[PDB]
């Protein structure tokens, strides 16, 4: 009964830190082992594989993995985490001399290094002449996280990281909105623990 196990469906790494994605297998005889990467709405790309040749296997872009029989492991590493490393990673193993079986996947999230945070909540108006608006919570660092709404008529998105290449500038943001006319941007993120210095323009 051969299997492959990846630890954690979602993992974080700080921008610039060592990348470590863990994979363990249960085969008695050593198997062939594979690491694949998948970007959004994209297919599977092979990074590297262990095919009973070298134990230290090297792949594209600084990826490596060492096959360790004594700990039944084949962990994927890269020396430094870059924003372009954000993807889902799958470990896989040969099985029954006839197929590859896949682990469940781990999505790697890269936490940008935000040296000068400028947390703020802004109100944005519809380009067309409704008075519809949304609220944008932006420019907070890595220690802020955004909580789900506790009010079923207010919608709040997960934090997303954008990378403005023109300015070599990354920033976090979350969006909130509601069809209540009274809903105010000062209250939109009241269920989240926000920075004490968040900017709330009048």
């Amino acid at each position: 009964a051969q299997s492959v196990t990846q630890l954690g469906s979602h993992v974080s790494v700080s921008e610039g830190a060592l990348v470590l994605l863990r994979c363990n297998y249960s085969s008695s005889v050593p198997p062939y082992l594979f690491w694949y990467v998948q970007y959004p709405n994209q297919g599977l790309q092979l990074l590297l594989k262990y095919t009973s040749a070298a134990t230290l296997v090297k792949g594209i872009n600084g990826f490596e993995a060492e096959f360790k029989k004594s700990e039944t492991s084949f962990h994927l590493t890269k020396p430094s985490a870059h924003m372009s490393d954000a993807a889902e990673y799958f470990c896989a193993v040969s099985e029954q001399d006839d197929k590859i079986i896949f682990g469940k996947g781990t999505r790697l999230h890269i936490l940008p290094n935000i040296q000068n945070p400028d947390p703020a909540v802004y109100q944005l108006r519809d380009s067309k002449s409704s008075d519809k608006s949304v609220c944008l919570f932006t420019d907070f660092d890595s220690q802020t996280n955004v909580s789900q709404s506790k009010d079923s008529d207010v919608y709040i998105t997960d934090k997303c990281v954008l990378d403005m290449r023109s300015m070599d500038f990354k920033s976090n943001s979350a969006v909130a909105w509601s069809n209540k006319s009274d809903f105010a941007c000062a209250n939109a993120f009241n269920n989240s623990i926000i920075p004490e210095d968040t900017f709330f323009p009048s």
Binding site: Y155, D158, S173
Partner: protein
């Protein structure tokens, strides 16, 4: 090979027989059908080592397959049900685990086509307070009221697709979470320098490609038939 799959996208009602086709050019003995679902990785449905050699994988229930030729391996959903909504991938292998994957089939199974609905799309303009505070300008696109969750959102500046400065939510949210057939919402941000937003010559468009009905689906409602289509919203830059 060039491993190719058809169709690339498909929406179907429940209870229908649906066929996916994998074709290769290299004539490898070994061909496979997998499905991918979030948190489960890729699970093997069926595989084949030659014409009329067929082997079950771990999730073969509800599916059948045929190996019509060295080059062709067909997958059928025998009577589609909603939990067969998935990304489907065929693969070939050589005799040394050299896999080649097709580019995938995104399949959505819905109970009732009457609930299909294209998005409404709006762009929200950058705040003056952001521009003053940061000398940057964030546009937000909101796509709302769509069903099923089968869209692609992109941004277009002066007629060319952009990727820099963009973040799109990785999955839409449910407008009515308690409902099995809730409509969905999706947001995206495009951030530019303030001076670029302040140029009234610059044109910003978010585009949402929606996958829905086709021309041969029946439609009995008064509202617009919710066919596969593009819905966009736009804003022009401005100084005042």
């Amino acid at each position: 090979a060039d491993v190719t799959q058809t169709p690339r996208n498909r929406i179907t009602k429940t209870g229908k027989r649906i066929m996916l086709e994998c074709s290769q050019t290299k004539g490898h003995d070994r061909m496979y059908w997998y499905r991918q679902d979030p948190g489960l990785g890729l699970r093997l449905i069926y595989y084949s080592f030659d014409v009329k050699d067929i082997n079950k994988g771990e999730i073969s229930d509800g599916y059948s397959v045929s190996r019509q030729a060295q080059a062709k391996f067909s997958l059928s959903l025998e009577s589609a049900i909603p939990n067969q909504t998935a990304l489907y991938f065929c693969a070939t292998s050589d005799e040394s685990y050299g896999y080649t994957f097709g580019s995938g089939t995104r399949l959505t199974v819905v109970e009732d086509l009457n609930k299909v609905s294209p998005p409404e799309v709006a762009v929200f303009e950058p705040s003056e307070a952001e521009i003053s505070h940061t000398q940057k300008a964030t546009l937000v696109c909101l796509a709302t009221g769509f069903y099923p969750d089968h869209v692609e959102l992109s941004w277009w500046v002066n007629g060319k697709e952009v990727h820099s400065g963009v973040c799109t939510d990785p999955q839409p949210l449910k407008e009515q979470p308690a409902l099995n057939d809730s409509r969905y919402s999706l947001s995206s941000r495009l951030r530019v320098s303030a001076t670029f937003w302040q140029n009234p010559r610059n044109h910003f468009r978010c585009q949402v490609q929606f996958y829905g009905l086709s021309e041969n689906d029946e439609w009995t409602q008064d509202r617009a038939k919710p066919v596969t289509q593009i819905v966009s919203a736009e804003a022009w830059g401005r100084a005042d």
